[PDB]
Design a protein around this motif. Sequence first.
Motif, PDB file in Angstrom:
ATOM      1  N   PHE A   3       0.887  -1.119  -0.259  1.00 37.51           N
ATOM      2  CA  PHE A   3      -0.030   0.003  -0.107  1.00 37.51           C
ATOM      3  C   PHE A   3       0.926   1.316  -0.120  1.00 37.51           C
ATOM      4  O   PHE A   3       1.650   1.644   0.967  1.00 37.51           O
ATOM      5  N   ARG A   4       0.913   1.852  -1.014  1.00 34.67           N
ATOM      6  CA  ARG A   4       1.832   2.997  -1.228  1.00 34.67           C
ATOM      7  C   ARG A   4       0.853   4.363  -1.314  1.00 34.67           C
ATOM      8  O   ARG A   4      -0.236   4.264  -2.225  1.00 34.67           O
ATOM      9  N   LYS A   5       1.406   5.595  -1.423  1.00 34.39           N
ATOM     10  CA  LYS A   5       0.935   6.691  -1.645  1.00 34.39           C
ATOM     11  C   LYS A   5       1.144   6.852  -3.043  1.00 34.39           C
ATOM     12  O   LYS A   5       2.377   7.198  -3.455  1.00 34.39           O
ATOM     13  N   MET A   6      -0.055   6.788  -3.723  1.00 34.70           N
ATOM     14  CA  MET A   6       0.267   6.511  -5.354  1.00 34.70           C
ATOM     15  C   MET A   6      -0.393   7.779  -6.091  1.00 34.70           C
ATOM     16  O   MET A   6      -1.412   8.233  -5.752  1.00 34.70           O
ATOM     17  N   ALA A   7       0.503   8.400  -6.863  1.00 33.86           N
ATOM     18  CA  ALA A   7      -0.004   9.418  -7.523  1.00 33.86           C
ATOM     19  C   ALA A   7      -0.459   9.025  -9.195  1.00 33.86           C
ATOM     20  O   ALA A   7      -0.076   7.717  -9.443  1.00 33.86           O
ATOM     21  N   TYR A 126       3.756  14.111  -6.776  1.00 32.75           N
ATOM     22  CA  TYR A 126       3.328  13.547  -5.448  1.00 32.75           C
ATOM     23  C   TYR A 126       1.786  13.492  -5.101  1.00 32.75           C
ATOM     24  O   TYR A 126       1.166  14.389  -5.669  1.00 32.75           O
ATOM     25  N   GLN A 127       1.386  12.701  -4.229  1.00 33.99           N
ATOM     26  CA  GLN A 127      -0.121  12.594  -3.975  1.00 33.99           C
ATOM     27  C   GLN A 127      -0.153  13.502  -2.669  1.00 33.99           C
ATOM     28  O   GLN A 127       0.661  13.723  -1.786  1.00 33.99           O
ATOM     29  N   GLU A 290      -4.426  10.538   4.338  1.00 29.12           N
ATOM     30  CA  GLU A 290      -4.660  11.047   2.889  1.00 29.12           C
ATOM     31  C   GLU A 290      -4.782  10.072   1.966  1.00 29.12           C
ATOM     32  O   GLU A 290      -4.299  10.019   0.701  1.00 29.12           O
TER      33      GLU A 290
ATOM     34  N   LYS B   5       7.326  12.431  -0.522  1.00 27.60           N
ATOM     35  CA  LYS B   5       7.958  11.223  -1.151  1.00 27.60           C
ATOM     36  C   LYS B   5       7.490  11.441  -2.768  1.00 27.60           C
ATOM     37  O   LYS B   5       6.348  11.502  -3.131  1.00 27.60           O
ATOM     38  N   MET B   6       8.508  11.951  -3.437  1.00 32.66           N
ATOM     39  CA  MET B   6       8.282  12.393  -4.578  1.00 32.66           C
ATOM     40  C   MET B   6       8.802  11.531  -5.875  1.00 32.66           C
ATOM     41  O   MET B   6       9.841  11.093  -5.661  1.00 32.66           O
ATOM     42  N   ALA B   7       7.980  11.246  -6.829  1.00 29.77           N
ATOM     43  CA  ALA B   7       8.173  10.679  -8.106  1.00 29.77           C
ATOM     44  C   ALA B   7       8.765  11.339  -9.288  1.00 29.77           C
ATOM     45  O   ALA B   7       8.267  12.616  -9.118  1.00 29.77           O
ATOM     46  N   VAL B 125       1.815   6.000 -10.451  1.00 31.04           N
ATOM     47  CA  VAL B 125       3.431   6.127 -10.098  1.00 31.04           C
ATOM     48  C   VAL B 125       3.502   6.488  -8.585  1.00 31.04           C
ATOM     49  O   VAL B 125       2.772   7.117  -7.876  1.00 31.04           O
ATOM     50  N   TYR B 126       4.754   5.774  -8.217  1.00 35.67           N
ATOM     51  CA  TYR B 126       5.068   5.956  -6.620  1.00 35.67           C
ATOM     52  C   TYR B 126       6.683   5.774  -6.797  1.00 35.67           C
ATOM     53  O   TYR B 126       7.223   5.352  -7.402  1.00 35.67           O
ATOM     54  N   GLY B 138       6.769  -2.618  -2.768  1.00 40.09           N
ATOM     55  CA  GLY B 138       6.197  -1.767  -3.937  1.00 40.09           C
ATOM     56  C   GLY B 138       4.450  -2.172  -3.599  1.00 40.09           C
ATOM     57  O   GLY B 138       4.074  -2.582  -2.614  1.00 40.09           O
ATOM     58  N   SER B 139       3.630  -1.599  -4.612  1.00 41.13           N
ATOM     59  CA  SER B 139       2.327  -1.959  -4.284  1.00 41.13           C
ATOM     60  C   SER B 139       1.675  -2.324  -5.760  1.00 41.13           C
ATOM     61  O   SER B 139       1.818  -1.630  -6.798  1.00 41.13           O
TER      62      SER B 139
END
Lengths: 305, 305
Positions: A3-7, A126-127, A290, B5-7, B125-126, B138-139
Amino acid sequence: SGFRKMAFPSGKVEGCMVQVTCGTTTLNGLWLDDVVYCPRHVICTSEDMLNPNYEDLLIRKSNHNFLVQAGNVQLRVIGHSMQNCVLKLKVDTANPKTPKYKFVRIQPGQTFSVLACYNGSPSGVYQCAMRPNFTIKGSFLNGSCGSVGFNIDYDCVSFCYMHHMELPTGVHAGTDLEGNFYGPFVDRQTAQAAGTDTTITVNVLAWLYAAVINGDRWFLNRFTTTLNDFNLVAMKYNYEPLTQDHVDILGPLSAQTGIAVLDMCASLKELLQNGMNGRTILGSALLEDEFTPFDVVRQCSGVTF
Amino acid sequence: SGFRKMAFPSGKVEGCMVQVTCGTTTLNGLWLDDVVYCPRHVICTSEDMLNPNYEDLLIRKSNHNFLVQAGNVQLRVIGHSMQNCVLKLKVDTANPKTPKYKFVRIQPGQTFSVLACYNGSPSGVYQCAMRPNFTIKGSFLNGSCGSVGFNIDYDCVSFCYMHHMELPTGVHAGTDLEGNFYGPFVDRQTAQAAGTDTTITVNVLAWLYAAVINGDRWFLNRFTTTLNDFNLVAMKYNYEPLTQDHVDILGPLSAQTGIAVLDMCASLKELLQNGMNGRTILGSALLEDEFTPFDVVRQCSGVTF
Ligand SMILES: CNC(=O)CN1C[C@]2(CCN(c3cncc4ccc(Cl)cc34)C2=O)c2cc(Cl)ccc2C1=O
Ligand SMILES: CNC(=O)CN1C[C@]2(CCN(c3cncc4ccc(Cl)cc34)C2=O)c2cc(Cl)ccc2C1=O
Ligand SMILES: [Cl-]
């Protein structure tokens, strides 16, 4: 699993970012069809920011005072108008990379991706979420104004935020794409401060359902709660009130896991009282707020572990 | 201000994602020039995954057995070969959106962006890091195989990871773009497990420098330490050893904040021995290790692509 903070993938937005310059001020613009949208404070100097009269500053400008750069090509400005806190620059070239899009105004608690840009060039994605006090906890430096927030559900980009400023606490404020600010902020260098922020309760509950879906139940208990008793307790921890709308919205996650919303509310009440006792939930030692119910459904497997 | 946390912007990679199907197995491929790169296990059924002889499974395939879809267009496969655990499908159309690129193999501790894809279509994207145990947190769901990890340096995309599988603990394993696995893993359904992981010490120190840059200084102290004494502490808390190379790499952040690297090591030793005492650093109650020294410099400087 995971589970990631996904954009959202940012490509559809990268193809719309341009640089807008008016005199000594330079910031980012969003090029959709033959219009470039940017913060109206591009026409201000640092001195103008205390009490700017935007109508008076704008009337002294011609189309050729605005320099718009798309990659290495100069676009020609053929018209301009102000709509609330946004400046709309009509250009002589429609953006060939214009995706399918909509302008949407979001409510607090809603999440979106931000494509941070400097000099019309994307630097990162980023998300984040619109906080209950209408600010965003972004990562922005000087020159990032005009960077946008968006969601890409299906193939349509819904633009929801345009960056205008950073408040004294380091948080950020901006507008929808019609130039209406979120919250009680103004595009003026006046004494402005973010109101007391609260935790997005419906989002914490959604993230607790994500933890259960991914295989973790250590935090559940044998208790339930009424909605009113949950709100009396939650408010004491600076949590937003949970409404019947929020309970309805959590319905699908409740059915996928077999845990009633008020039973998950009882688990949240206990977590607030006890802390995590050295344990983590989805790799976090804090209660995450978030991720919306919709984000959890989008990212998680439809089959609970 | 702010630290997220920026991609990297994903657009250059989105324009390379395709869907690859061989029989009943469908996954993602990376289309660069006239070659589609994808995991070689696309040639396997669920039964084959138990003990596959990839050369034997591949010899029974013709070019027409591989269906490659780029958006709504079908690409024609005109050749195929295997390189380690990657299958290379020669197609009759060079990708017109091929960016400037390199294939690079990264080391544990290094971070990269992942563009998660399903059916050749990007979904998110993460940002993540190659763990010291060579797995990534990962997710990913079923259908995500072939999704890639990358970094950007100016206009050049450096592809470093291709997704192949998920381990029983929910973590992920894959290869570089030449098909060499990261970690002692094999591309088959057998008893495999992630080894005991450790914390990326140089990354935690970089994130402590990011917190100082952002105004969080409560954890600083008057003390210093030696590299040998700090390494004795790091070994006790499952932290990776800190080397002179790591100390040299942290030099710029040390000069920007005025805090010697061994001075920051003394702060980390105290956080390891005492915890945070109810406090947070950059909104986290855990010591974050998925930001490299370069990531901190890039995010606190606004580097564009
Ligand atoms: C922190 N702000 C300032 O010291 C000066 N300041 C300039 C400005 C325009 C640029 N900008 C920034 C926007 N995002 C991240 C920033 C990070 C660091 C800085 Cl110094 C500025 C940033 C503002 O906040 C602004 C615009 C508007 Cl509409 C209303 C007020 C202001 C304003 O107060
Ligand atoms: C957890 N996996 C399984 O039960 C079956 N499994 C299938 C597979 C191919 C797909 N895949 C997944 C990749 N990422 C996220 C996944 C999430 C949920 C599932 Cl069920 C599968 C995922 C694998 O791990 C695989 C590939 C290779 Cl090279 C070697 C072995 C396997 C394998 O064991
Ligand atoms: Cl909304």
